[PDB]
Design a protein around this ligand. Structure first.
Ligand SMILES: CCCN1CCC(N(Cc2ccc3c(c2)OCO3)C(=O)Nc2cccc(C(F)(F)F)c2)CC1
Length: 366
């Protein structure tokens, strides 16, 4: 009962959790962070173990049920609140942070905690001049000074909101952000289902971004938004992606697209994108991907990368209808990577899909 959120009902509805939900984002399924470690919620590290089962054990232990690696928002808030309590304890025994923290009102304390989550105690303690201004209630001067920092350059939109919070002592920046995202989402949402954007809204989104829906850039955007399926774009996907990408407008999203595209050059990221495509393309009711749909997506994602793509098309157009399983999809990229220009190094004993064995027999003589 100690962690029950009902114990916080005397607070405002806006709080540090909701603040970090906007500034960092909330994930309700176990995922791997930057450094490859299993994480959930708002940046809550579960374990450094490579074992997902280990991560699930820790999570189940913490939540008190068999989660299967999926939690609710309220469960994420409980984890986050533990983390906040630890951050506050640290602040309160730090001679450079305690005096300013103690001096601040509740809303501005949240802004300081936000900073500590982003940059750690040492990072925040480096702002000696600005912290002194805050301790002295010189809010406008503190705001001006913080805006000159590398922090501002690293995360300008988050930093601006945190600074506004210090300037005003209100949640205005966060109310405004939420409203801006709601109003933007409302431009695209399905009028018959407010939980998602349908085909017409996706088209409008593409048009607003000046992109052809058939372009690889649109698939890259879906990948960055971790979209579940090609047929719709959920409210949760839209909000989570805009949050993760640090964007509260179409202009900002447009400026981010080239950066998304560049990520495909970093280690493992093209493979991640390629594998994502299968799940996105497949009918949610089906386990495999219809061959015709697989061809369409292969032609988008592998053109200019897979030197045998045209022969692959010729091969498949002769083939009978089948569901392409995930493993066959995934292994085609590995085939593309290893295969010699004349196919002379294919290992028939490599446990490739039969489809690829058959392709090599078809192609070697062409
Ligand atoms: C070779 C693969 C081509 N590809 C297939 C999927 C098409 N499509 C759904 C869509 C988008 C626009 C359409 C349409 C269907 O029919 C008419 O106009 C989507 O990408 N949907 C989508 C779903 C969630 C998020 C997003 C995204 F974030 F905008 F990128 C797009 C876009 C074109």
């Amino acid at each position: 009962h100690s962690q029950d959120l009902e114990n916080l009902y005397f607070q405002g509805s806006m709080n540090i959790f909701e603040m970090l939900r906007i500034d960092e984002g909330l994930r309700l399924k176990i995922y791997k962070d930057t450094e490859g470690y299993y994480t959930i919620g708002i940046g809550h590290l579960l374990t450094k173990s490579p074992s997902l089962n280990a991560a699930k054990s820790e999570l189940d232990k913490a939540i008190g049920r068999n989660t299967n690696g999926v939690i609710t928002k309220d469960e994420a808030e409980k984890l986050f609140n533990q983390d906040v309590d630890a951050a506050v304890r640290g602040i309160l025994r730090n001679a450079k942070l305690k005096p300013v923290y103690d001096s601040l009102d509740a809303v501005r304390r949240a802004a300081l905690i936000n900073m500590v989550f982003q940059m750690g105690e040492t990072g925040v303690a480096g702002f000696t001049n600005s912290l002194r201004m805050l301790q002295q209630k010189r809010w406008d001067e503190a705001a001006v000074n913080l805006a000159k920092s590398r922090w501002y350059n690293q995360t300008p939109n988050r930093t601006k909101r945190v600074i506004t919070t210090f300037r005003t002592g209100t949640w205005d920046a966060y109310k405004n952000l939420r409203k801006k995202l709601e109003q933007l989402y409302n431009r695209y949402k399905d009028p018959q289902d407010e939980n998602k954007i349908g085909i017409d809204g996706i088209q409008q989104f593409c048009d607003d971004l000046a992109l052809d829906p058939a372009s690889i850039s649109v698939l890259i955007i879906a990948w960055k938004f971790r979209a579940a399926t090609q047929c719709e774009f959920s409210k949760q996907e839209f909000m989570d992606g805009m949050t993760e990408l640090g964007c509260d407008s179409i202009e900002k999203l447009k400026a981010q697209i080239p950066k998304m595209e560049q990520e495909l050059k970093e280690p493992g990221r093209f493979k991640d994108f390629y594998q994502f495509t299968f799940n996105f393309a497949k009918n949610p009711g089906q386990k495999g991907l219809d061959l015709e749909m697989a061809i369409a997506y292969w032609n988008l994602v592998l053109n200019g990368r897979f030197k045998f793509l045209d022969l692959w098309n010729k091969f498949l157009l002769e083939h009978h209808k089948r569901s392409i399983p995930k493993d066959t999809w995934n292994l085609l990229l590995d085939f593309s990577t290893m295969i010699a220009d004349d196919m002379s190094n294919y290992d028939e004993e490599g446990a490739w899909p039969v489809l690829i064995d058959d392709f090599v027999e078809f192609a070697r003589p062409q």
